[PDB]
Structures are given as C-alpha cells and as structure tokens.
Design a protein around this ligand. Structure first.
Ligand code: NA
Ligand code: NA
Ligand code: NA
Lengths: 246, 246
C-alpha cells in the first residue's frame, strides 16, 4: 500500500524446496510491504480459486447468494471431486473450493454485472474474456500478489464497494486458523500443472490479525506437479513463523 | 426451547472426573435439545465471562463500541492479569476475557440501556442490580444452559434485537476453532472458586457449524479449585467428539 521493500533473505525458504515464487507481506500499522522478489510480486497470474473471494462478495451483492445460510444443493450429477458431491454452505464451498458452485454463481451474476464489480474492486487486469464460468481458471483474468494484498486490505477494512454485511459474511467464510493470540483468514488457488515450460500457478492469500496488528499476505509459485501443492502454505507459514507472526 | 431430552450415555464423562455439571446439546435448533441432567439444564447460574457476548452486542448497538476495529487502550494502570495490560481489539478482549474492558463498556451503556437490552434478549433472570460493572461477576444475574443455547441460536440466526452487522462482528470475535470440516464459536466463563459449601461455576458455551448442520451447546459445572478449570472444555469436547461433531 504505502511502500514495498525487497528482502532477499526470505529466498532461503524458496531455495530449500527448489520453488520459483513470491511472498508479499504487508503490515497495516506501518503501511509497508516486504517481498522476496519485487519483479514477481508485480507479475500477474490466473487467480484460480482465490477468485472465490470476489465472486462470493458479488454473488451476495447481486442477491444471487441470498445470505450466509444459503445451501448450495447438489443435484446428484457427478462432479470432479468427491468432496464436492454434497450440499454445501457458502463457507463449505469456499473451504473445499467447489468450482461448480462458483461457476453457477458467475453464470447468474452475468457478464455485465461481473465486469462492473471487478472495476469497482480494481481486481487484476479486469479481463473476464474466456467464458463467464471460466475466465478466472483458464481465461484472460490475471492478478498480481501486490494487487491481491490491496484487495484483501480493502475487504478487511470493509472498504470494498459492497455492504459491510456482505463483506463480513465472506470474511467469516475465510477463517482458516483460530488461536487465542491470532486469527488467520485465507484462501488457496491452483490453476493446474500447466504446459511444457508453461507451468501453472498456486496461490495462498489472506491476512493475520494478531494483538492490534494486521498482516496481509499473498504467495504464489510456479507449479508443474500436484505433489508440490502443499508448499503454497508451508513456505509462507515458515516465513511468517520466522517473523514471529504465527 | 421445545423439548429437552435426557441422555444418560454422557454421564461417564462427568463421573470419571467427579464433576457435578450439565451439558446441553441441540442439533439444528433449540426445538430439540439433549442433556445429561434435566433439572440442571434449566438451573440458573452467574454467567461470568459468557456475559461478554451480550455485553459486546449491546456495546455496539449503543455505539459505546464504535465498530469492530475499535482499540481498547490500556491506561497503564495495574490490571488483575498481565494479559490484560495492553491495548486490545474487541476479539482480543473477548479471547483473553479482559474484565476491565467490559466493565467500562457496561458503565457507559448504563443501567437503563443495559436493562432494556437484556429484556429484549430474554437473557436469564435479567437482574442487573447491585452495581453496573459487576452484576455478571458477583451480582444477581443468573442464566441457565438452556437459555444460553436459545440466546446463541438467536445470535447464529441474526435474530437478536440488534443489527445483523453487529451480530456478525461479535460472531467473528467468538471463533475459537477453524477446520475445513467445521467451525467452532465459543466462550468460557468462571465465577471463581466460591466460598465454603458454595462452589463457583465454570462455563463453556457456543456452537459448531459442520457440513450444513449447526449444533448449539452449553456446559456448566460446579468448581471450587482452579485446577479443575480445563474440564469445562474437555468434558464437552469429549462428548461432542463421541457424537461425531468435532
Ligand atoms: Na496494501
Ligand atoms: Na483489572
Ligand atoms: Na479452560
């Protein structure tokens, strides 16, 4: 937000796992960000499942999602993951990253409204070409790690162009770790393993509330093998542990 | 509360530890609750720290608490626990049960407004007499485990006499365990070790959201020694683990 500085000593955690990626960590009270790689922090990637955050907000703003108690019913027709073949709440759909639930939300939102909200949210390159139910997974939408933390800061502050109520609803849906000393809100994403010399992207984005401080973060990495997927949490977790945050 | 049913199969969790207490567990709604002790389920006890839940809602409704980013500044004067001697957010004050923060909230709310809201909330015997900053600590206010689950169900459903925004703010402050499969919101309470032939009371109340289901719970127990305090979480946790909820 206010400043950004490269800290190449965080590269130790990437090097140990042979990962090409970036971590951006911003401290709210000092309005200052740090990253291991300023260049990659500005590079723009498919959001994949991280797009569930804006999509949920927009679904609520448009009334497509009634409220946090709506149940997305399973129609019994097979889905790509057994964990998706069941009725889901909004939190449940976000937590398991149920693609087909959010494809249907996008379809009902429609292109004109989706375009309007991504403009209000300043979300990425705001390019929703590629089909209304796939632009964030295989279409032309791209967002950087810096843009992710800017968006998440706005959500945390209830400053997005949506009701505070709907921003609070989506925040509750994103809580992933609760301790007496700190609270973590987060979302993963994974575009797939990509092509030969054209790897996919994996993301972990979110924020940590600790004492009266708030830390916004966004991680992404190249990925060509699902077996590396847990590194999208363990590398950023080790960095935030070394920083004394969690 | 529709009907309360006795369930004898939990008694082993109490007798193992020589605890006199009650657990109330309600699936979906307060229409159907189960308990180990029908009489004690409706017996009224001092709420202690569980009162921070209504106190926070009333603080927000009255504007005494400005919003969920309010910081409760520590004036540097001694407080009864070192963990209270610091600036605290609302979630922070709740999670460490910072009595003095909630005493000052209660003082600013004042007796007239406090009485009005406990009546709206149907909060126990609604007796706030004896001192506006200690009626839930050593005064005459009493609430049962059944009334706790009814109040918490209203809060879960956003049906208390308060804005939905303020209900959502307090719910976020009460998250205590987050797992992909389930989310726990809860609050502890402890009146003290009592006096001769007159034990104190310890509480754990909350709800669990799992798949598309919700479970409301309230536990209390007699206690005359602080060494027994962890049982207020371990007995109900073991019951809910055996029920398959957590
Ligand atoms: Na920022
Ligand atoms: Na004190
Ligand atoms: Na305890």
């Amino acid at each position: 937000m206010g400043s950004i500085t490269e800290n190449t000593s965080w590269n130790k955690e990437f090097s140990a796992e042979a990962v090409n990626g970036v971590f951006v960590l911003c401290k709210s009270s000092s309005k200052s960000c740090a990253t291991n790689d300023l260049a990659r922090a500005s590079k723009e990637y498919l959001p994949a499942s991280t797009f569930k955050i804006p999509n949920a907000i927009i679904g609520l703003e448009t009334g497509v999602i009634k409220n946090e108690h709506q149940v997305f019913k399973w129609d019994g027709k097979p889905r790509a993951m057994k964990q998706w073949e069941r009725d889901l709440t909004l939190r449940g759909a976000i937590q398991v990253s149920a693609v087909p639930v959010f494809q249907q939300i996008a379809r009902e939102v429609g292109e004109v409204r989706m375009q309007k909200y991504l403009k209000k949210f300043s979300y990425g390159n705001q390019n929703i070409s590629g089909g209304i139910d796939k632009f964030w997974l295989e279409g032309q939408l791209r967002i950087s790690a810096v843009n992710q933390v800017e968006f998440l800061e706005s959500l945390y502050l209830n400053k997005l162009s949506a009701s505070k109520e709907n921003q609070l609803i989506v925040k509750e849906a994103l809580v992933t770790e609760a301790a007496p000393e700190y609270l973590v809100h987060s979302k993963t994403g994974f575009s797939g393993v990509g092509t030969e010399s054209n790897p996919g992207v994996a993301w972990w984005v979110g924020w940590v509330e600790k004492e009266t401080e708030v830390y916004f973060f966004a991680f992404n990495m190249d990925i060509d093998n699902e077996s590396k997927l847990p590194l999208r949490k363990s590398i950023p977790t080790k960095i935030m542990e070394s920083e004394g945050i969690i």
